[PDB]
Amino acid sequence: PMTLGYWNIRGLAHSIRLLLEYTDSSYEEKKYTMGDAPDYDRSQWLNEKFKLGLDFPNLPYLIDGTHKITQSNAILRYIARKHNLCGESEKEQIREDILENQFMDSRMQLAKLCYDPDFEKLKPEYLQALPEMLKLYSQFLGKQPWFLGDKITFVDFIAYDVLERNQVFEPSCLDAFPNLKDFISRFEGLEKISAYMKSSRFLPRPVFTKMAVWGNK
């Protein structure tokens, strides 16, 4: 009944699919397929972009009855509130807002690099900064199981996605940060997550679109 639309890519829908599975949401998925170079045909999307009742037609989108949602973060927040997977105290909401935005910034830095035709020249640059970036997240998590404390929340589904895809970009990057390694194990070990990661539905790759220099397959 619920419908998640997005490319046949991990990208921005990863955290979402994971949240939908963790919350036991009843949903199905509409996967749009982009053609290959040099056109990268998007007609499969464009042909019904403005025919879905979306206020701001975009990918990913979530259609839950009367609620038609765009913007990944908004889609996550919607499902999160629906299952009380949100920060409660003021301190938890602050950390929740800071993280939601920080991780998106980090997500975009990697995407920017990977889509750039000068990926090879720019990559060293990114690798140099990775330890510093990871360290801030590591310090923030500290001895806590989840980014907001004792309860798992939606930022954890985001945290997971960007931290893990960095692990696949540079496998050794998390070695110096035990807690982030444990975060990833802790998350993948969750009952509903583990089961889903074994199913056919699980789509960890490709990370990006066919337009990427890295992660395109």
Ligand X SMILES: N[C@@H](CCC(=O)N[C@@H](CSSC[C@H](NC(=O)CC[C@H](N)C(=O)O)C(=O)NCC(=O)O)C(=O)NCC(=O)O)C(=O)O
Binding site for ligand X (CB under 6 A): 11-12, 58-60, 71-73, 101, 105, 107-108, 111-112, 115, 208-209
Q: Please count the CA atoms within 13 angstroms of the CA of 117 that sit on its side-chain side.
A: 0
Distance CA 212, CA 217 (A): 9
Any known ligand binding at 186?
Answer: no
Any known ligand binding at 72?
Answer: yes
Instruction: Pick one of ligand X, a copy of itself, none as the site partner of residue 56 (Cβ within 5 to 8 A by kind).
Output: a copy of itself
Any residues with CB less than 8 A from the CB of 139 and at least 6 apart, and which?
A: none
Residue 69 in the binding site for a copy of itself (CB under 8 A): yes
Residue 101 in the binding site for a copy of itself (CB under 8 A): yes
Nearest distance from C-beta of residue 36 to ligand X, angstroms: 15
Any residues with CB less than 8 A from the CB of 71 and at least 6 apart, and which?
A: 56, 58
Name the token pair of 197: 């990661």
Nearest CA-CA partner of 7 in 30, 25, 26: 30
Q: Which of 30, 42, 49, 77 binds a copy of itself (CB under 8 A)?
A: 77
Any known ligand binding at 59?
Answer: yes
Name the token pair of 192: 């509903």
Residue 97 in the binding site for a copy of itself (CB under 8 A): yes
Any known ligand binding at 6?
Answer: yes
Nearer to ligand X, 5 or 87 (CB): 5
Distance CA 217, CA 211 (A): 10
Binding-site annotation, residues: 6-7, 42-45, 49, 58-59, 71-72, 115
